DNA sequence: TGGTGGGCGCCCGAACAGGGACTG
DNA sequence: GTCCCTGTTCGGGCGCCC
């Protein structure tokens, strides 16, 4: 047998006890489905309620494929799991990934199913599938393999990783591959279809050794920032004065390089809101100054890997959405948008999480790292119905915040 | 018998031991139940005789069970409850009547003595110490130990509820078109075979759960609609609740009132319209169990409405798979909502409300999406899918809200319903300033130390005013300024506040409030055609917020 | 007459958890 | 830091079932 590897949790920290939470026919048929065929294979086992611990667990539908996936929800047990990450990882992250044309991303999860999963670890990745109308009392299984989700489970295939790959690496040296947990990632400066040939070669190594091997066509490079922006007014009125300094006096928590003064000059007095007010030509230079200060890229934000990306996203409304990711408040690494159907039917919801997949993958293609997203979204209502959308094999940690009406008309485009 | 199934492994939490706890005085009633029960039981080899080796006891009573002809022997384990491992509990919840669909035969079976017929871990056995005291002249009396479940032990429920899955397992694979909703050892079982047929395949069960060492007792529900099961009696086209009983006290108090919510809730399930407001709003201050409380006007007249709601003879009906989940939503008062959900229009599967209030301030469009959110969850656990929506909502007054509103927030299908009292907004700020309205340079200022305050506004056409407040807070102030703008103005108005706190309530465009300060404030734009709010960043010498901040500040 | 256990539900009140605004 | 105000969680009582 291949020798099994020691793993610890976190010192002080005990294993995850979160509940399950009611799934839809559709899936539950799912899970059993999958569940009893994973138990024939003897990679998870039923297991009793004397083992304390709890993962959730549920399916997505990828594509429109006629499978489909469990997804356990790990973030809980990951937070817990001693780091492999720091303390048993070695890997640099591919900058060059970054920069390629195409990238597909393919889920390697399955591989991870062929190496055993330390016994005295297995009652921590414990998970229970529920039933319609609670006609049964919850079933109960544990992991026996390595979990797809577990982020130990990357870190201990990582060797075999590198022996599986180490020959399509040295023939396309001009293709980068990066591992993130359950996916591959794959980027080439290929034009598509040959790329395309390329992943479809990939994969033929990573069937040569089982057993076996979506989320197609990202381009890193057709990715870009969203500056703040002032707009243009032929007549000015105090209203827009007073939101114009509004906007900026808070810009320049991010942009130092920021003034206001001659622009708040405009405003003295006790004016009504809707009168004119000429532009006095310094203050008419002013926002001259602040509109390329403003083009400027922020400085001095350096990436620290010891710390959580935080990710901000606001509802711009009509379909649009702004990101940005920092993580020390008003030090942005990236910010962006986000458009979609105007349509009659749009969906907040499924249009939220969509962000928070696009916004994640472009964090781990970029660090390596997954970003906590400040979620602008009640509790109940995303959790709720997030899960009819993900389609990703990673989760990331989340909070929900009721975000101040001001902090959108910032970052809100002309 | 026991069953002959394995045990499950637990321990005590680590470096504790078992309890010693002297047994407490038996009535002699049931002192003679017990040994009754206990030598029974000893013969079965269900407990058995402990010497001077076992140190620990722990107290151990009976009570009469539902015929009230037999004896419940319980043990009070809270000490060694206090000291066992934990579990992952495995009954999820709480099966419901409406989630059945109609089968062809039904039968409900209960398991003999259940607990006492699953084993319990050897190792821990010891733990279980108890003692029957006898009349004591004639007796010690005689100690003795479980080798089964105790009914009392915070392990055994879970046990229990594993080690049946465990033992129906075999059988459902068999027979997996026969339908066996299982809770604890409470058995409904359906078919869509003919009364013979189905009636053979019952003895097969009760066979195979024999063969596991689980009698089956009559007790035995047969050709015999209706049925009673779960609280319930299932007839076969519909079902309802057990009679609901509600008190009739004339000095109602803490645990009168909060067992008489208690009782509303549970009826609500098929009930229409029961609300419990004003009655839960009595729950509030008081410190305990028993302080007496005298009913409100109003919450003596909501119980008056519940009563005679609960006159009417209602039922239920069972789920149809090959037809569409509808619930309809009405609006009851202060933020309370009742739904009912049916496939055809006027057979109920079931109703409820959703009363729940979140949040300091809201308005009556978020609780209506909030009574979606539940029942939606709910629809999933019962049916498990998702429900098509009747709201007393015009989809303008949505459309308006999803576009007004800055958070993300989204109703799954639906359709209006002409059903008053329709959900609206009940006043919109403005986008854009208003031409010819007064504008209104507002603030307010408290002092920490003293807590005293000003709130006043400036306005563009000259006129200024400063309300002096005692023991107020910062935040207050500038709600205050807010109100006497609104005051002071015509239908319409321009309002500049410094405050993000007070401009990110009435944005949110809250109907109602816990605070008496954001009500009056909110009569107020109801009142007004057309307010604007804008903001402006505080002590930045953007005037006239300039010149109210040098009003405000005598603090 | 009390005195036990687990589940789910509902209410309510405590402990926190944040943000925002203050002082000189 | 300090006050506020607001949100979350948890636990307690009651209901119902076994
Ligand atoms: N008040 C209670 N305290 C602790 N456990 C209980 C209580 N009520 C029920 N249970 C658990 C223990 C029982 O073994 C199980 C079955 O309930 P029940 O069928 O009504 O009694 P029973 O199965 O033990 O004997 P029987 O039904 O033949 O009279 O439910
Ligand atoms: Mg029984
Ligand atoms: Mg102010």
Same mark, same amino acid.
């Given at each position: 047998?291949?020798e099994?590897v020691?793993?610890?949790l976190?010192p002080?920290? *005990?294993?995850?006890?979160v509940?399950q939470?009611?799934?839809?026919? %559709?899936?539950i048929?799912?899970?059993?489905?999958?569940?009893?065929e994973?138990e024939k294979?003897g990679?998870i @086992?039923?297991? /009793?309620?004397?083992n304390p611990?709890?993962?959730?667990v549920f399916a997505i539908?990828?594509k429109?494929?006629?499978?489909?996936?469990?997804?356990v929800d790990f973030?809980?047990?990951?937070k817990? +799991?001693? *780091?492999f990450?720091?303390?048993?990882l070695?890997?640099?992250?591919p900058?060059?990934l970054k920069?390629?044309?195409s990238?597909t991303?393919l889920?390697? /999860?399955?591989?991870?199913?062929?190496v055993?999963?330390d016994?005295?670890?297995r009652?921590?990745?414990?998970?229970t599938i529920?039933?319609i109308?609670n006609?049964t009392?919850?079933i109960?299984?544990?992991?026996?393999?390595?979990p797809q989700?577990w982020?130990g @489970?990357?870190?201990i295939?990582?060797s @075999?990783?590198?022996?599986?790959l180490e020959?399509?690496?040295?023939?396309?040296?001009?293709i980068?591959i990066y591992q993130?947990? *359950?996916?591959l990632?794959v980027?080439?400066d290929? =034009?598509?279809g040959?790329?395309?040939?390329k992943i479809? !070669?990939?994969?033929?190594?990573?069937?040569r050794?089982?057993?076996?091997?979506? /989320?197609?066509?990202?381009?890193?490079?057709?990715?870009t920032?969203?500056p703040i922006?002032?707009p243009?007014?032929?007549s000015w009125?105090?209203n827009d004065?007073?939101?114009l300094?509004?906007?900026?006096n808070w810009?320049?928590?991010?942009?130092?390089?920021?003034?206001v003064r001659?622009?708040?000059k405009?405003?003295?007095?006790?004016?009504?809101l809707?009168?004119?007010?000429?532009?006095? =030509? %310094?203050a008419?230079?002013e926002?001259a =100054?602040?509109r390329?200060?403003?083009?400027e890229?922020?400085?001095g934000?350096?990436?620290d890997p010891?710390? *959580?990306?935080?990710?901000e996203?606001?509802?711009?409304?009509q379909?649009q959405? +702004?990101?940005?990711?920092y993580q =020390?408040?008003?030090?942005?690494?990236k +910010?962006?948008?986000?458009?979609?159907?105007?349509?009659?039917?749009?969906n907040?919801?499924?249009?939220?999480?969509?962000?928070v997949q696009k916004?994640?993958? !472009?964090?781990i293609?970029?660090?390596?790292?997954?970003?906590?997203f400040?979620?602008?979204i009640?509790?109940?209502?995303?959790? +709720?119905?997030?899960?009819e959308?993900?389609?990703?094999?990673?989760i990331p940690?989340?909070?929900?915040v009721?975000?101040?009406?001001?902090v959108k008309?910032?970052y809100?485009?002309? | 018998?026991?069953?002959?199934?394995?045990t499950?492994?637990?321990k005590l939490k680590?470096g504790?031991?078992?309890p010693?706890?002297?047994?407490?005085?038996?009535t002699?009633? $049931? &002192?003679?139940?017990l040994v009754?029960?206990?030598?029974?039981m000893?013969?079965?080899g269900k407990?058995s005789?402990?010497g001077?080796?076992?140190?620990?006891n722990?107290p151990?009573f009976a009570i009469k069970?539902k015929?009230?002809?037999?004896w419940?022997?319980?043990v009070?384990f809270r000490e060694?409850?206090?000291?066992?491992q934990?579990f992952?509990?495995?009954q999820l919840? &709480?099966?419901?009547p409406?989630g059945?669909?109609?089968?062809?035969?039904?039968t409900?079976?209960?398991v003999?003595?259940?607990?006492?017929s699953?084993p319990?871990?050897?190792?821990?056995?010891?733990?279980?110490?108890?003692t029957?005291?006898?009349?004591?002249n004639?007796?010690?009396?005689?100690?003795?130990?479980?080798?089964?479940?105790?009914?009392?032990?915070?392990?055994?429920?879970?046990?229990?509820?594993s080690s049946?899955? $465990?033992?129906?397992?075999?059988?459902?694979?068999?027979?997996?078109?026969?339908?066996?909703?299982?809770?604890?050892?409470?058995?409904?079982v359906?078919?869509?075979?003919?009364?013979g047929?189905?009636?053979?395949?019952?003895?097969?069960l009760?066979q195979h759960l024999?063969?596991?060492?689980?009698?089956?007792?009559?007790?035995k529900?047969?050709k015999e609609?209706?049925?009673?099961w779960?609280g319930?009696?299932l007839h076969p086209?519909?079902?309802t609740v057990?009679?609901?009983?509600?008190?009739?006290?004339?000095?109602?108090?803490?645990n009168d009132?909060?067992?008489?919510?208690?009782?509303?809730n549970?009826?609500?399930?098929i009930?229409?319209g029961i609300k419990?407001?004003?009655?839960?709003?009595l729950?509030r201050?008081?410190?305990?169990? #028993?302080?007496?409380?005298?009913?409100?006007?109003?919450?003596?007249?909501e119980l008056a409405?519940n009563?005679e709601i609960?006159?009417?003879p209602?039922?239920?009906?069972?789920?149809?798979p090959?037809k569409?989940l &509808?619930?309809?939503?009405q609006?009851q008062?202060?933020?309370?909502?009742?739904?009912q959900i049916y496939?055809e229009?006027?057979?109920?599967?079931?109703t409820?409300k959703?009363?729940?209030?979140?949040?300091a301030?809201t308005?009556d469009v $978020?609780?209506l999406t909030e009574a979606?959110?539940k029942?939606?969850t709910e629809?999933?656990?019962?049916?498990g899918?998702?429900?098509?929506?009747?709201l007393?909502?015009?989809?303008?007054?949505w459309?308006?809200?999803?576009t007004?509103?800055?958070?993300?927030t989204?109703?799954?299908?639906?359709?209006?319903?002409?059903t008053?009292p329709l959900?609206?907004?009940?006043?919109?700020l403005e986008?854009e300033?208003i031409?010819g309205?007064e504008?209104?340079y507002?603030?307010?200022?408290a002092?920490?130390?003293?807590?005293?305050g000003?709130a006043?506004?400036? #306005?563009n056409?000259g006129?200024?005013?400063?309300?002096?407040?005692?023991?107020?807070?910062?935040?207050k102030?500038?709600?205050?300024?807010?109100?006497?703008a609104?005051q002071d103005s015509?239908?319409?108005?321009?309002?500049?506040?410094d405050?993000?706190?007070?401009?990110?309530?009435?944005?949110?465009?809250?109907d109602?409030?816990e605070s008496?300060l954001?009500?009056?404030?909110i009569?107020?734009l109801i009142?007004k055609?057309?307010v604007?709010?804008?903001?402006?960043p505080a002590?930045?010498?953007?005037?006239?917020?300039?010149?109210v901040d040098?009003?405000?500040s005598?603090?």
């Amino acid at each position: 047998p291949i020798e099994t590897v020691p793993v610890k949790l976190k010192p002080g920290m *005990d294993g995850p006890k979160v509940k399950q939470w009611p799934l839809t026919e %559709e899936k539950i048929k799912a899970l059993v489905e999958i569940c009893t065929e994973m138990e024939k294979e003897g990679k998870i @086992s039923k297991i /009793g309620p004397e083992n304390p611990y709890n993962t959730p667990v549920f399916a997505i539908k990828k594509k429109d494929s006629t499978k489909w996936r469990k997804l356990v929800d790990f973030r809980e047990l990951n937070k817990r +799991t001693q *780091d492999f990450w720091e303390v048993q990882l070695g890997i640099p992250h591919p900058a060059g990934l970054k920069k390629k044309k195409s990238v597909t991303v393919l889920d390697v /999860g399955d591989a991870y199913f062929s190496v055993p999963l330390d016994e005295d670890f297995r009652k921590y990745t414990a998970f229970t599938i529920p039933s319609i109308n609670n006609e049964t009392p919850g079933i109960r299984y544990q992991y026996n393999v390595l979990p797809q989700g577990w982020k130990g @489970s990357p870190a201990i295939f990582q060797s @075999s990783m590198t022996k599986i790959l180490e020959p399509f690496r040295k023939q396309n040296p001009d293709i980068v591959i990066y591992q993130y947990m *359950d996916d591959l990632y794959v980027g080439s400066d290929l =034009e598509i279809g040959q790329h395309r040939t390329k992943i479809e !070669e990939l994969r033929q190594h990573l069937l040569r050794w089982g057993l076996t091997t979506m /989320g197609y066509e990202l381009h890193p490079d057709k990715w870009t920032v969203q500056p703040i922006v002032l707009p243009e007014k032929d007549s000015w009125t105090v209203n827009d004065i007073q939101k114009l300094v509004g906007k900026l006096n808070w810009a320049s928590q991010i942009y130092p390089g920021i003034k206001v003064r001659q622009l708040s000059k405009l405003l003295r007095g006790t004016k009504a809101l809707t009168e004119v007010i000429p532009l006095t =030509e %310094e203050a008419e230079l002013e926002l001259a =100054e602040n509109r390329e200060i403003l083009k400027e890229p922020v400085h001095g934000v350096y990436y620290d890997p010891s710390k *959580d990306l935080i990710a901000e996203i606001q509802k711009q409304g009509q379909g649009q959405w +702004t990101y940005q990711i920092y993580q =020390e408040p008003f030090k942005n690494l990236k +910010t962006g948008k986000y458009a979609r159907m105007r349509g009659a039917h749009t969906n907040d919801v499924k249009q939220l999480t969509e962000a928070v997949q696009k916004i994640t993958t !472009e964090s781990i293609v970029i660090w390596g790292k997954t970003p906590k997203f400040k979620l602008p979204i009640q509790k109940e209502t995303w959790e +709720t119905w997030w899960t009819e959308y993900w389609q990703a094999t990673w989760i990331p940690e989340w909070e929900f915040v009721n975000t101040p009406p001001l902090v959108k008309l910032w970052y809100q485009l002309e | 018998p026991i069953s002959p199934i394995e045990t499950v492994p637990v321990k005590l939490k680590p470096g504790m031991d078992g309890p010693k706890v002297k047994q407490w005085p038996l009535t002699e009633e $049931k &002192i003679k139940a017990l040994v009754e029960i206990c030598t029974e039981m000893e013969k079965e080899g269900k407990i058995s005789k402990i010497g001077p080796e076992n140190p620990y006891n722990t107290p151990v009573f009976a009570i009469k069970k539902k015929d009230s002809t037999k004896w419940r022997k319980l043990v009070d384990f809270r000490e060694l409850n206090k000291r066992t491992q934990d579990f992952w509990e495995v009954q999820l919840g &709480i099966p419901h009547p409406a989630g059945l669909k109609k089968k062809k035969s039904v039968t409900v079976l209960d398991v003999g003595d259940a607990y006492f017929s699953v084993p319990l871990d050897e190792d821990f056995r010891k733990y279980t110490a108890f003692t029957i005291p006898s009349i004591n002249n004639e007796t010690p009396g005689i100690r003795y130990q479980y080798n089964v479940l105790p009914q009392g032990w915070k392990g055994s429920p879970a046990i229990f509820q594993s080690s049946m899955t $465990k033992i129906l397992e075999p059988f459902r694979k068999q027979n997996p078109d026969i339908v066996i909703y299982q809770y604890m050892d409470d058995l409904y079982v359906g078919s869509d075979l003919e009364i013979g047929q189905h009636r053979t395949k019952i003895e097969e069960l009760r066979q195979h759960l024999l063969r596991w060492g689980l009698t089956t007792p009559d007790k035995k529900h047969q050709k015999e609609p209706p049925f009673l099961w779960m609280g319930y009696e299932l007839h076969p086209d519909k079902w309802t609740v057990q009679p609901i009983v509600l008190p009739e006290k004339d000095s109602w108090t803490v645990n009168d009132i909060c067992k008489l919510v208690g009782k509303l809730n549970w009826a609500s399930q098929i009930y229409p319209g029961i609300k419990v407001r004003q009655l839960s709003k009595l729950l509030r201050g008081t410190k305990a169990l #028993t302080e007496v409380i005298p009913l409100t006007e109003e919450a003596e007249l909501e119980l008056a409405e519940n009563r005679e709601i609960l006159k009417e003879p209602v039922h239920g009906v069972y789920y149809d798979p090959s037809k569409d989940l &509808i619930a309809e939503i009405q609006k009851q008062g202060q933020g309370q909502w009742t739904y009912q959900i049916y496939q055809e229009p006027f057979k109920n599967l079931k109703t409820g409300k959703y009363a729940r209030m979140r949040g300091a301030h809201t308005n009556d469009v $978020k609780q209506l999406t909030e009574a979606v959110q539940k029942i939606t969850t709910e629809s999933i656990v019962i049916w498990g899918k998702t429900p098509k929506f009747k709201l007393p909502i015009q989809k303008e007054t949505w459309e308006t809200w999803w576009t007004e509103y800055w958070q993300a927030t989204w109703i799954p299908e639906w359709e209006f319903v002409n059903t008053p009292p329709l959900v609206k907004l009940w006043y919109q700020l403005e986008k854009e300033p208003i031409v010819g309205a007064e504008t209104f340079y507002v603030d307010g200022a408290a002092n920490r130390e003293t807590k005293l305050g000003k709130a006043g506004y400036v #306005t563009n056409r000259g006129r200024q005013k400063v309300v002096t407040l005692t023991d107020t807070t910062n935040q207050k102030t500038e709600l205050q300024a807010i109100y006497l703008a609104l005051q002071d103005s015509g239908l319409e108005v321009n309002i500049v506040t410094d405050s993000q706190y007070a401009l990110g309530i009435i944005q949110a465009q809250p109907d109602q409030s816990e605070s008496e300060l954001v009500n009056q404030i909110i009569e107020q734009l109801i009142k007004k055609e057309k307010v604007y709010l804008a903001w402006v960043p505080a002590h930045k010498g953007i005037g006239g917020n300039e010149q109210v901040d040098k009003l405000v500040s005598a603090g």
